[PDB]
Amino acid sequence: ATFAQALQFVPETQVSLLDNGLRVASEQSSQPTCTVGVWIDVGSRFETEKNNGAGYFLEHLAFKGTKNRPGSALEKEVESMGAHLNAYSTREHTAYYIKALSKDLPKAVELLGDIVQNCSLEDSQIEKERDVILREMQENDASMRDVVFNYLHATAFQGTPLAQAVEGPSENVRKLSRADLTEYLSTHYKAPRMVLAAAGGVEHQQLLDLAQKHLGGIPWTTPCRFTGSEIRHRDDALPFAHVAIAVEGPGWASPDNVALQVANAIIANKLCQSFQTFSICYAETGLLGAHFVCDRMKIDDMMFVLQGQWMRLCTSATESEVARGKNILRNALVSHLDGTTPVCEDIGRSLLTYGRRIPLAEWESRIAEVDASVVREICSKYIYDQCPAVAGYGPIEQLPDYNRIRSGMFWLRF
Amino acid sequence: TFLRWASEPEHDHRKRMGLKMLMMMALLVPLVYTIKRHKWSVLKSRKLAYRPP
Secondary structure (H helix, E strand, C coil), X not given: CCHHHHHCCCCCCEEEECXXXXXXXXXXXXXXXXXXXXXXXXXXXXXXXXXXXXXXXXHHHHCCEECCCEHHHHHHXXXXXXXXXXXXXXXXXXXXXXXXEHHHHHHHHHHHHHHHCCECCCHHHHHHHHHHHHHHHHHHHHCHHHHHHHHXXXXXXXXXXXXXXXXXXXXXXXXXXXXXXXXXXXXXXXXCCEEEEEEECCCHHHHHHHHHHXXXXXXXXXXXXXXXXXXXXXXXXXXXXXXXXXXXXXXXXXXXHHHHHHHHHHCCCCCCCEEEEEEEECCCCEEEEEEEEECCCCHHHHHHHHHHHHHHHHHCCCHHHXXXXXXXXXXXXXXXXXXXXXXXXXXXXXXXXXXXXXXXXXXXXXXXXXXXXHHHHHHHHHCCCCCCEEEEECCCCCCCCHHHHHHCCCCCCC | CHHHHHHCCCHHXXXXXXXXXXXXXXXXXXXXXXXXXXXXHHHHHCCCCCCCC
16 A cells, blocks of 8 residues: 555546536545535636625625525524535635535535525625625734735736735725626626535535536636736834745646645745745746745845745755655645545635646656756746745835845856 | 157057047946946835825
């Protein structure tokens, strides 16, 4: 039972295409419980400035009422079965998933359909959601990391729909009318842009039957540029500095993603406080970089260490470090896929992203392909001598100026 | 003319080096100025906002 041998034991995810275009995917397993869900290829990047907060508002009011049963009735039905409904919205995906028992599958799928097709947008509920989101703005204001990453996206993509926040501006959510939400639903929540994904104790034909019964009535019928800018909010009274630096990364459909993951896994928090590396991926672009918290007096040293690690990977990457990174990536993948909710989310996102559920054997073969020479070449392709996007939430004063940061992206020795 | 040559035997060489350095400066000054503008454009074009709570 070697690792490569063990990967074959993973059951495949059967995929079927309905008449209206909805893609139904399942990963059956000997699990007492399952997590069904609907994933939609609609996010903030598909919204104009007129309706920037439309998707987040729809997520807020999705469980607050549908035509068949009022919001209280929907919530009571969820709670009585013991299930947990959840939803999330990214700049490119939107998911509603019901986590329940294997024998509760027939109801849950129906629930999803009731949420997806016929959503009751009560005006009073809409105003209540307005108030809730207005409070949630101040709630999110506390989170420094989220503000930093929003700054990073805004400065990196600027004049692109990929740069606006998922929540949207306060004015936009304030003036977002019901008709705008209905138009957003009509133009976006439609098959074949939907994947009904389930895993665990679910039989694929059962899921297909439920989808045809409930999710069968769904209607059948700008250049993204990376600008290496920076944003610098100071607020010197904050305890620790937050910084996120990134460069444009490849989209979802690119072989270089695995090498970049290995490079990130290869990337000393002693100088820092909590330093992390991220490889956010989108359809055609992506943010590959790092994010760390700093003392007021140690931003420069941490930035120097991070950029030195980047340069070392780009120029001279030994085989031992690359092997360690590959092992770390394999362990991270397999450990992340543990759990019913993770595999369901992976199925949905993969279908919305690759058009297919890439098996673990392919992932491991691709990782085995990765070599120190490949790591160096791809890192030089994407990291070496590239204009970065920097976002700093203060206290930032020791953060090097953009010319210094840019000059730190190449080595005079090399 | 001979007395001028005796006073300045380097006259021709001085003129030649002057022409060469004039051409050199005509090449360099716009280039170095462009380099300075390129390096300083980040500050020259940066926009700042004040957002009190």
